[PDB]
Amino acid sequence: KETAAAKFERQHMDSSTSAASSSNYCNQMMKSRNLTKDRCKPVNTFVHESLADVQAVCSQKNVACKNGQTNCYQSYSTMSITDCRETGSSKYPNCAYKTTQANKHAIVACEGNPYVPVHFDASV
Numbered sequence: 001k002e003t004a005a006a007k008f009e010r011q012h013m014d015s016s017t018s019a020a021s022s023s024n025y026c027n028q029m030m031k032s033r034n035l036t037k038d039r040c041k042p043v044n045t046f047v048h049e050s051l052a053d054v055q056a057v058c059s060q061k062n063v064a065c066k067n068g069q070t071n072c073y074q075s076y077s078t079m080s081i082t083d084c085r086e087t088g089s090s091k092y093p094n095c096a097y098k099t100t101q102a103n104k105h106a107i108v109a110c111e112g113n114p115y116v117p118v119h120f121d122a123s124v
């Protein structure tokens, strides 16, 4: 199987780049991270910061989650983030995504020991 922490790293971490390069970034990242292996993930976010920086968010501003869980945290400073969403013309296995780059505060759900991100709630 895949631990929650490892899944978050695969699905949302991207420290190799400082920002989404071109409009084909999401089509490639969603593919290479295996987010389109069995089906097209409708929406997914990538953070362009070190793993340490993203994990550090677990000890920053503790905010409520969308579902109501009290284990979400918001990064004190804005981070380089890329939002990948399926376009109107996307059908498995031909998944197509729209790349929307921006700098927003990352909000992640943390759990376990070490207390690391296991879910990406939103970006604000």
Ligand SMILES: [Cl-]
Pocket (backbone or CB within 6 Å): 001, 002, 003, 006, 007
């Ligand atoms: Cl794993």
Ligand SMILES: [Cl-]
Pocket (backbone or CB within 6 Å): 010, 033, 034
């Ligand atoms: Cl995988």
Ligand SMILES: [Cl-]
Pocket (backbone or CB within 6 Å): 043, 044, 045, 120
């Ligand atoms: Cl996401």
